[PDB]
Amino acid sequence: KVWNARNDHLTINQWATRIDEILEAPDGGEVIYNVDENDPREYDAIFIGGGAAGRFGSAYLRAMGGRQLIVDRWPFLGGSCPHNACVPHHLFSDCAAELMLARTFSGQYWFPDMTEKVVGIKEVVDLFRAGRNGPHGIMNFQSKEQLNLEYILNCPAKVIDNHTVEAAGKVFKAKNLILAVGAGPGTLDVPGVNAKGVFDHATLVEELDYEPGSTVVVVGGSKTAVEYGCFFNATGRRTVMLVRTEPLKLIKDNETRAYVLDRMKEQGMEIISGSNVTRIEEDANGRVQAVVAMTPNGEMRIETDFVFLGLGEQPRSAELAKILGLDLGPKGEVLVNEYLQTSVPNVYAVGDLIGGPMEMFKARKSGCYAARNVMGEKISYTPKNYPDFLHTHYEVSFLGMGEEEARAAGHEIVTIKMPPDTENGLNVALPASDRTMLYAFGKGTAHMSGFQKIVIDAKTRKVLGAHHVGYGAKDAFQYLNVLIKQGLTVDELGDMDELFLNPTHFIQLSRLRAGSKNLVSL
Amino acid sequence: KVWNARNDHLTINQWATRIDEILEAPDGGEVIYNVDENDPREYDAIFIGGGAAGRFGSAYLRAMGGRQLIVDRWPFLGGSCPHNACVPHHLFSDCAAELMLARTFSGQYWFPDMTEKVVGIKEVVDLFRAGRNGPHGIMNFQSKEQLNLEYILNCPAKVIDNHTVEAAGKVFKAKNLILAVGAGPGTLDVPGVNAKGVFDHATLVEELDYEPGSTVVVVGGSKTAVEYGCFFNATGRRTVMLVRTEPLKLIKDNETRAYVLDRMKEQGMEIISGSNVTRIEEDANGRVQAVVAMTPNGEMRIETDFVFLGLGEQPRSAELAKILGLDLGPKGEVLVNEYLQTSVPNVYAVGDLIGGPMEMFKARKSGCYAARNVMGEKISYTPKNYPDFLHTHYEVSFLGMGEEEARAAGHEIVTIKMPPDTENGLNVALPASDRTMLYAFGKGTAHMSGFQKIVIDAKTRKVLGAHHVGYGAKDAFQYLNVLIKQGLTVDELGDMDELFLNPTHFIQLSRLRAGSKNLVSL
Ligand SMILES: Cc1cc2nc3c(=O)[nH]c(=O)nc-3n(C[C@H](O)[C@H](O)[C@H](O)COP(=O)(O)OP(=O)(O)OC[C@H]3O[C@@H](n4cnc5c(N)ncnc54)[C@H](O)[C@@H]3O)c2cc1C
Ligand SMILES: Cc1cc2nc3c(=O)[nH]c(=O)nc-3n(C[C@H](O)[C@H](O)[C@H](O)COP(=O)(O)OP(=O)(O)OC[C@H]3O[C@@H](n4cnc5c(N)ncnc54)[C@H](O)[C@@H]3O)c2cc1C
Numbered sequence A, B: 001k002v003w004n005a006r007n008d009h010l011t012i013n014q015w016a017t018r019i020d021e022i023l024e025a026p027d028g029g030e031v032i033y034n035v036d037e038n039d040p041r042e043y044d045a046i047f048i049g050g051g052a053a054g055r056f057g058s059a060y061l062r063a064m065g066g067r068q069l070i071v072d073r074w075p076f077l078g079g080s081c082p083h084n085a086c087v088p089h090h091l092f093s094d095c096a097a098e099l100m101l102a103r104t105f106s107g108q109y110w111f112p113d114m115t116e117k118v119v120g121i122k123e124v125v126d127l128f129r130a131g132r133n134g135p136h137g138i139m140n141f142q143s144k145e146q147l148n149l150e151y152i153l154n155c156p157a158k159v160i161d162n163h164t165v166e167a168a169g170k171v172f173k174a175k176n177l178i179l180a181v182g183a184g185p186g187t188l189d190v191p192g193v194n195a196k197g198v199f200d201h202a203t204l205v206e207e208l209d210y211e212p213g214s215t216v217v218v219v220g221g222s223k224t225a226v227e228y229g230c231f232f233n234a235t236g237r238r239t240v241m242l243v244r245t246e247p248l249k250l251i252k253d254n255e256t257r258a259y260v261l262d263r264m265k266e267q268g269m270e271i272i273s274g275s276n277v278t279r280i281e282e283d284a285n286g287r288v289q290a291v292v293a294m295t296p297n298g299e300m301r302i303e304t305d306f307v308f309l310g311l312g313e314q315p316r317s318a319e320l321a322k323i324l325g326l327d328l329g330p331k332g333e334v335l336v337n338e339y340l341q342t343s344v345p346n347v348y349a350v351g352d353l354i355g356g357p358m359e360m361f362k363a364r365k366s367g368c369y370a371a372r373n374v375m376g377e378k379i380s381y382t383p384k385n386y387p388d389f390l391h392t393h394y395e396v397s398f399l400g401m402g403e404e405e406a407r408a409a410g411h412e413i414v415t416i417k418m419p420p421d422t423e424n425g426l427n428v429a430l431p432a433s434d435r436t437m438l439y440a441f442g443k444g445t446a447h448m449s450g451f452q453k454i455v456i457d458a459k460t461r462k463v464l465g466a467h468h469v470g471y472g473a474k475d476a477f478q479y480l481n482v483l484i485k486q487g488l489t490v491d492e493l494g495d496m497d498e499l500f501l502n503p504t505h506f507i508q509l510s511r512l513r514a515g516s517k518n519l520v521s522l
Helices: A012-024 A052-062 A086-104 A121-131 A133-146 A223-234 A254-266 A318-323 A360-374 A403-408 A437-441 A474-487 A506-515 B012-024 B052-064 B086-104 B121-131 B133-146 B223-234 B254-266 B360-374 B403-408 B437-441 B474-487 B490-494 B506-515
Strands: A002-004 A031-034 A045-048 A068-071 A151-153 A164-167 A170-173 A177-179 A198-200 A215-219 A238-243 A270-273 A276-282 A288-295 A298-303 A307-309 A347-349 A388-391 A395-400 A413-418 A451-457 A463-470 B002-004 B031-034 B045-048 B068-071 B151-153 B164-167 B170-173 B177-179 B183-185 B198-200 B215-219 B238-243 B270-273 B276-282 B288-295 B298-303 B307-309 B313-315 B347-349 B388-391 B395-400 B413-418 B451-457 B463-470
Touching (some): A012 A133, A045 A052, A045 A360, A052 A068, A052 A133, A052 A360, A052 B506, A068 A164, A086 A121, A086 A223, A086 A388, A086 A437, A086 B437, A121 B437, A133 A151, A215 A223, A215 A298, A223 A254, A223 A388, A238 A288, A254 A270, A254 A395, A254 A403, A254 A451, A254 A463, A347 A360, A388 A474, A395 A474, A403 A413, A403 A451, A403 A463, A437 B086, A437 B121, A451 A506, A463 A474, A474 B474, B045 B052, B045 B360, B052 B068, B052 B360, B068 B164, B086 B223, B086 B437, B133 B151, B177 B360, B215 B223, B215 B298, B223 B238, B223 B254, B223 B307, B223 B388, B254 B270, B254 B395, B254 B403, B254 B451, B254 B463, B388 B474, B395 B474, B403 B413, B403 B451, B413 B506, B451 B506, B463 B474, B490 B506
Parallel strands (some): A002 A031, A045 A068, A045 A177, A068 A151, A177 A347, A198 A307, A238 A270, B002 B031, B068 B151, B198 B307, B238 B270
Antiparallel strands (some): A276 A288, A288 A298, A413 A451, B031 B151, B164 B170, B276 B288, B288 B298, B388 B395, B395 B463, B451 B463
16 A cells, blocks of 8 residues: 655666556555655645646755655656646657658658558557656656655645645645646536547547547647647548637637648548537447537537547646635636735645646746745746647647737737748748658648748837747747747847748848838738 | 840749749750849949849848849859758758658558668659749749849859959949859769769759669768768668768767767668778769778778769859959858958958858858948858757757867856666657657657757856757757857746747756756756
């Protein structure tokens, strides 16, 4: 039941294996108990959850000289991201981008005929399962031996009160409490929602014990939905998305959002806007069999032994806002002030638990900023004006105001974009750069070369927003955003040193546009 | 002979078609003559060469209100990049990256067996030729109709003197002259260097009238050499690189350069350092047959009907520095002061013509900066501290000092990198992000997940240099460099918002490392 790992010093590999074993043990495995039982000082903070925010938070506070304790249901630190979130998601996104390639040039060059070819989903999510523990074991080993971090894994945390928490059957006290439990996968209140064939991002990497059929239904219209959507599509499975409202609302710039959509459509993806699932039919055995759903244009039935749920993630606050009596928002997000402080004192919330944006960076900063505050610091954090992205078969990166948006905000904008305005529209070997070259030179695929734009303020010449579809631009937005935040003028942008061919052709195009007396041109 | 295109207004497509025709016509085609014969003002500057530097410079000067003229040998604006340089090089790089993937997972997943499979080089360079004319046509159409730029294409420029140039059989006078003729492919003074089978970057996209054999010989050790080298290797052909000195010197941080090499080695590439070509044997017919060369370890003969020369590019200064009597450097570079001014007054040099760095950004900036100066501005330009990159089967981005390099400069460095120090070395699913997920989770491919490092100065903790091997990092370095030049501290870097999984895991690692009292750790 309880394993005092304190003095064992397992190898990363040993960790990886031990993790697998616990993770697969039928009874839930033993409890990893790792606490320095010689230290006299009391816990400056106990992290409820050792994932993105939890882990980071703990490492940062520990580095400040404080004493911390992490508690997690899972036998490893890290959170959703490396077990069923980001990571496995990127894996599928990679395939998505590759398959769309293999399929655009089926037979041609070194590409096999994809016609009639449907890739094995299970097989790939199986690969993921086969290695995802490697990093875990590294996280565990590296946290205990190098960071001296104290934690208790594979054990649910019992927050008794404001200064006490229980785990491993013992009782703990701490000057503070920082909640980092995150959010759980969204769900649908409809009959059949539990039919064997239904899946969500998390349940997919643990329950896919069969290979899906020629058709798949994805419910949702934002990130994860589109991401996993375009991946199933890529596997050569008719994919029908049922969106409650509108897909990819996150892509504020219209043209960009449009280009993306048309690309998905073009891959055979069927996106239904304003569609609510009526119910999910089963078999005599109990597995999914077909999906019935209402759409603005009447009901419709669709046969499929596979359904993936891509609804928003739900902050796991309920039970905690009950024990501590915390304030919650309209989405169940634990309210926190500019210091990650909840209504209750000495208590902090940091993960997805505080709602959007529900990204790693927020999780890591928030969990870090909080630990800093408990150590007496008065740092305030309010995520606003940040870079973003999402996959499909392409990489969609965006930051700032979309075109339309800027006008509504009063600005008199001008816009530089690629490809350019020509009677040939998107059917040009523009824009091009790494991983879009083939699309650019292929026969009738140029319109796939990718799409990008930048919003600039005429008079004040400041960059208001950057939008790019393609590849190799994401990592750039992290840094491009910072500069934009300092006050980047089209002039200052056109003065940088580009690396042609660059995923984003903003630098050169700015230099050129900036030269004109009046920015207007488009 | 001379076509007054002035009043014709062709379509982008007509331009493309016209360009292909002129480009394939046996007598060299007609001269495109596009000069505004109504304007009274004299030319503020005539650009000798209308490629990267020329075209751009012209656009900027035109935008400033000045009158300009472009002249050229080629029937299109743009230069080497879109015809036989960058672009085609990228197309080969993508294939190089895609093939390495495909080959690492032969038979696996949707990946066909690659064993014994050799991709068609001719076919892929044939695809490039089939569409490279699209962008020219656009460059041409856009330049004349939208930018009102004046030019003369498909006609070598005759610089009579300091203020006069001849073209299309007419004589022109200009207040200034700005030479942007660039550099021509390097060569080897050895017997057989001309045997039909010998190629270079520019001759490959115009004379590859056959399909290479099972073996290839590349002469060189830097960018284009390795670039085309990993591609031929990728097509599954024994590739032997003969390096006069040492390969990839351009990658200053040792570890980085080391990783990159091992990878290539791993791909079957044979790289010979301190190797010079003795001679190139031919056939009764006259095509390459084998290569003989000296290596530290005695001479060696290697049979091949295909040889690619990847030597440095040689500034096209000879004949111009003879007419204007310009000062030159040890490499043939037209000397210019901080104002792109040559020894001769009213004469500016800007392309690869001025030597290194020979990249698009320099050619464009210098091209642009010079034009600004002729308009009266006193802008000085001296390329230093710029981002850089080059392909293999991986994308290699570096900027600033390498580790070893920082020390030699007196700095007492610390270094945060991926993967981390562990008994599993590189064989871990770290680092990972887009397009490296499969390598990361494959069986025994983790060591291919990639490599990346950052050099930080203990005390002042300012960033000295970033190094990354993988994909989707190049474009980031453009902006990451800008911030590093502002004086970026490991603290300010850890504070940015990352987009996990990010090609570069710098942000989050620095936030964590910056927390510690003393950066030391490695
Ligand atoms: C499919 C998908 C893809 C994504 N891709 C990206 C991406 O590419 N980039 C990005 O920046 N973000 C991405 N995100 C979002 C990102 O995963 C989250 O914002 C981030 O993981 C949240 O971190 P956190 O620490 O708040 O929560 P988590 O990392 O989810 O961790 C919460 C932790 O608390 C523990 N816990 C929960 N309840 C209890 C309990 N009762 N007792 C004990 N422990 C408990 C968990 O076991 C876990 O360790 C993605 C999300 C999904 C669903
Ligand atoms: C294989 C290869 C790959 C490369 N990849 C990259 C890359 O990825 N990124 C990057 O930034 N740089 C890259 N470069 C380098 C880059 O191509 C050059 O630095 C840049 O093109 C130089 O521009 P320029 O204007 O100086 O010369 P060019 O663009 O080469 O143009 C010179 C112009 O002058 C004309 N001209 C020459 N002689 C005459 C004459 N006698 N009469 C009339 N016109 C004449 C030409 O026809 C041409 O239009 C690469 C180079 C090579 C060889």
